[PDB]
Design a protein around this ligand. Structure first.
Ligand code: MNT
Length: 305
């Protein structure tokens, strides 16, 4: 779809809040590939996602997968902290013929076989063993791999996203000192040239920087999640309102500067979804009811006028 590409930013922003520069960079690289300006035998895009934990990296990879390939299922997550022990290559691409687990294939290769159109997410690439890192280079160069079975795995329709906890303490200092996004991107690059040779970094479409989320941005994520929960309740014809306090209650608990907004899912589950379920099962919240949710001395409270 043409205008899907032409309006990819607002499309990715349907699910991902803030990180405009990150989304612009991503959207621009997909457009160059789709216009036919880059190598047809390389992947669609290769990115290095930098910044703090839980600020929209996975959610961007998911949204990109849903937007371009119809579903979030078209995202493959390979955590490199599990592939650092040298015997890891056979886990990624398969055990050799005659060895236990040859018929199983490899974690990455089998996933990209049954989903040639997929977004691939590599977590903490610095941790990966040099031999695992060489396989990553082969994807970036050849646009293809050969697994242990000898079957060629195509990567030309994939979008490669690499993440790194490396360089994030610098970008935090960058925003503290008030540097523009431009020079933050340029300063982190020098930190990266100390852990990766420019051989690798030049193959990347963009070096992408994610910021910490502001108070306003956290609210917008809460709203988006309440929007999905609202759809589920609408099937029972149940309306749900939250007071500003109730929205701030969830925002305060669902975000911390260490894990980002990762706690939010189970905060919403523990503080809103589990209590609401109880009220529904008891009979206090019925089909056709409009619920107002407010803050009390113990937690969120539910009332039906
Ligand atoms: C089924 N999933 C959920 C259900 C309820 C609440 C959150 C989630 C969930 O996956 O929530 C995810 C998405 C959400 N989030 C963080 N930053 C942003 C942002 N800038 N824009 C939009 N969302 C963001 O916070 C959670 C963690 O973020 P992440 O992007 O998965 O982590 P990381 O940035 O480390 O990859």
């Amino acid at each position: 779809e043409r205008e899907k590409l032409l309006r990819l930013e607002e499309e990715l922003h349907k699910r991902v809040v803030g990180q405009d520069e990150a989304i612009r960079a991503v959207a621009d690289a997909i457009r160059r590939a789709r216009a036919g300006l880059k190598d047809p035998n390389r992947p669609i895009g290769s990115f290095l996602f930098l910044g703090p934990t839980g600020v929209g990296q996975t959610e961007l990879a998911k949204t990109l997968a849903a937007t371009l390939f119809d579903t979030e299922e078209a995202m493959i997550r390979i955590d490199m902290t599990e592939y650092m022990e040298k015997h890891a290559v056979s886990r990624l691409i398969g055990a050799p013929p005659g060895y236990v687990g040859y018929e199983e294939g490899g974690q990455l290769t089998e996933a990209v076989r049954r989903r040639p159109y997929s977004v691939i997410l590599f977590d903490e690439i610095e941790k990966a063993h040099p031999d695992v890192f060489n396989i990553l280079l082969q994807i970036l160069d050849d646009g293809r791999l050969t697994d242990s079975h000898g079957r060629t795995v195509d990567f030309r329709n994939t979008v490669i996203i690499l993440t790194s906890n490396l360089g994030s303490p610098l970008i935090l200092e960058g925003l503290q000192k008030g540097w523009p996004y431009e020079r933050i991107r340029d300063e982190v690059f020098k930190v990266l040239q100390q852990h990766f040779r420019p051989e690798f970094l030049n193959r990347l479409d963009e070096i992408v920087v994610f910021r910490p989320l502001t108070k306003e941005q956290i609210r917008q994520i809460v709203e988006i999640q309440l929007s999905y929960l609202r759809a589920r309740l609408a099937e029972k014809r149940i309306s749900l309102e939250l007071t500003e306090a109730a929205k701030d209650f969830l925002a305060e608990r669902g975000y911390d500067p260490v894990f980002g907004a990762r706690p939010l899912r189970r905060v919403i589950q523990r503080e809103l979804e589990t209590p609401l379920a109880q009220k529904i099962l008891a009979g206090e919240v019925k089909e056709g009811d409009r619920v107002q949710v407010d803050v009390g001395p113990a937690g969120l409270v539910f009332a039906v006028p």
